[PDB]
Paper text:
Y126C is less frequent but still occurs with an appreciable frequency. The Y126C mutation induced a small cavity on the surface of the loop-sheet-helix motif. In the wild-type structure, the side chain of Tyr126 is sandwiched between Pro128 and Phe113, forming stabilizing hydrophobic and π-interactions. These interactions are lost in the mutant, explaining the high stability loss. The side chain of Cys126 adopts two alternative conformations in the crystal structure, one of which is pointing in the direction of the phenolic group in the wild type, whereas the other, occurring with lower occupancy, faces the backbone of Leu114. Residues 115–120 in the neighboring L1 loop could not be unambiguously modeled, indicating a high conformational flexibility of this region. The flip of Phe113, however, was also observed for the wild-type reference. The strongest stabilization overall was observed for the Y126C mutant (particularly prominent in the series at low temperature) where the mutation site is directly next to the ATO binding site, which becomes more dynamic upon mutation and is, therefore, poised for interaction with ATO. However, the mutation-induced cavities for Y126C and Y205C are relatively small compared with the extended surface crevice in the already druggable Y220C mutant.
Due to its low intrinsic stability, the human p53 DBD is very susceptible to inactivation by destabilizing mutations, resulting in unfolding, followed by rapid aggregation at body temperature. Here, we have systematically analyzed the structural and stability effects of all oncogenic Tyr-to-Cys mutations (Y126C, Y163C, Y205C, Y220C, Y234C, and Y236C) in the p53 DNA-binding domain (DBD).
Numbering used by the authors: 96 to 114, 122 to 182, 186 to 291
Amino acid sequence: SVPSQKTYQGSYGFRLGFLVTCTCSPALNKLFCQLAKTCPVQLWVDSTPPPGTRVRAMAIYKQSQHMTEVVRRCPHHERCDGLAPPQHLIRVEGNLRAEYLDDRNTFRHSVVVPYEPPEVGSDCTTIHYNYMCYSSCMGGMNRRPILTIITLEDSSGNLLGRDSFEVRVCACPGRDRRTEEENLRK
Ligand SMILES: [Zn+2]
């Protein structure tokens, strides 16, 4: 079954926040980012989850007619850090404990890091993601919009919380955000 995108704050009050290489549109719930550049995603909790809590990131297609298709890199960007497998769209930057996972039954990719409390000077835990293929790449996303689903999980993989956002990976994020926002006003 297609991974759920249902927002679920859960017992710890889990939700995301956001912070031109990367720009977020709250009105569109959409992140616009350049290829392979830092995308800061903030984790907010009302209380601290138990030891061994994990944070998983996974991409799915937004449109229902493409939801059962695995999101992966196009051949050009696949065939081009030594930790992320070449097929994975999403990689984590600056984390010594990233796990790159392929689901045995769905073939979907994800990247998991341990949950850490907020870094000094912050009320939220910031994770730096990189997207390794453009929304427009033929043989990959092929202009189809995607969602990133962030799941807070216990050490066994049980769901503690879930949030999600749309992503466009593009060369001019600031300009594309304005275009899509101008389209929503019209
Ligand atoms: Zn590509």
